[PDB]
Amino acid sequence: GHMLYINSFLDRMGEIIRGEKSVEEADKLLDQKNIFEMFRSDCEEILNLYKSGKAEKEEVQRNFYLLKTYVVSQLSIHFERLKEFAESKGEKKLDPEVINEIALYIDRVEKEV
Amino acid sequence: GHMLYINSFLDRMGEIIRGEKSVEEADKLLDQKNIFEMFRSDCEEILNLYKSGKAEKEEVQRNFYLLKTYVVSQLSIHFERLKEFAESKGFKIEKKLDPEVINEIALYIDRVEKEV
């Protein structure tokens, strides 16, 4: 697989950084509970694509591999970047242990595939 | 939204790391000339999804944003990752990636991003 990559957190960060959406939005985004939920929804959406045959299994597997690798390798850095982007214009953080839980959840959901 | 994200370098790297492809393949992947041509071919595939109506302009705009930001901010890291991976595994690579080449790939994407 080679095309499919849902990631709501990443796209929403990009909207704010490109100045397409208000920096005020960083506040709900930088909330670890909402972040955990965003990824859950991503997982549910990707899985629904597989279940309905709309995306082939290999594209959904690629998306899960990318999503897990994003959470493990980039999410902590991105959160801090966006936290710093926001503050440098006028709070909370993301516990490494929540990041693990997101990775765990993606591992779980995927087993279905 | 958005679902589309073509990136051939990222996927091939991931395939070598996962063991789906031989480590023998890292050497070809990490030739900076092949790297530049790979991103050029990706832009063209992406442009053709738009031009064949398989992806809307905002999907391909998302792909080019991620691809441009991948090149400027992740491509050197993944290059080094893969070297470090091929070395441990016993196939040390004697290739490097010019900062200037990174710049020219980003700039090239920046170029085709300006559309159709």
Residues near B54 by beta carbon (within 8 Å), at least 6 away in sequence: none
Compute how many other C-beta atoms are within 10 angstroms of the C-beta atom of residue A61.
Answer: 17
Instruction: List the domains of chain B with CATH numbers.
Output: 1-116 (1.10.3200.10)
| Dist. CA A112–CA A110, nearest whole Å | 5
Number of H helices, E strands in chain B: 6, 0
Compute how many other C-beta atoms are within 10 angstroms of the C-beta atom of residue B74.
Answer: 17
C-alpha pair distances (Å), B47 with each of A109, B59, B115: 33, 11, 8
CB within 8 Å: A11 and B2: yes
Resolution (angstroms) stands at 2.0
Question: 13-42 in B: which are within 8 Å (CB) of A?
Answer: 14, 18
**Whether B85 contacts chain A with CB within 8 A:** no
- The whole-angstrom distance between B91's CA and the closest CA on chain A is 24
Residues near A109 by beta carbon (within 8 Å), at least 6 away in sequence: A43, A44, A46, A47, A64
Report chain B's terminal Cα–Cα distance, integer Å: 21
By what method was this entry solved? X-ray
- The whole-angstrom distance between A98's CA and the closest CA on chain B is 24
Q: With contact defined as beta carbons under 8 Å apart, do B27 and B91 qualify?
A: yes
HSE-CB for A60 with a 13 A CA cutoff:
23
The residue among B22, B24, B83, B5 whose CA lies nearest residue A65 is B5
Q: With contact defined as beta carbons under 8 Å apart, do A1 and A62 qualify?
A: yes
Q: What are B73's two structure tokens?
A: 């901010």
- The whole-angstrom distance between B82's CA and the closest CA on chain A is 15
| Dist. CA A45–CA A47, nearest whole Å | 5
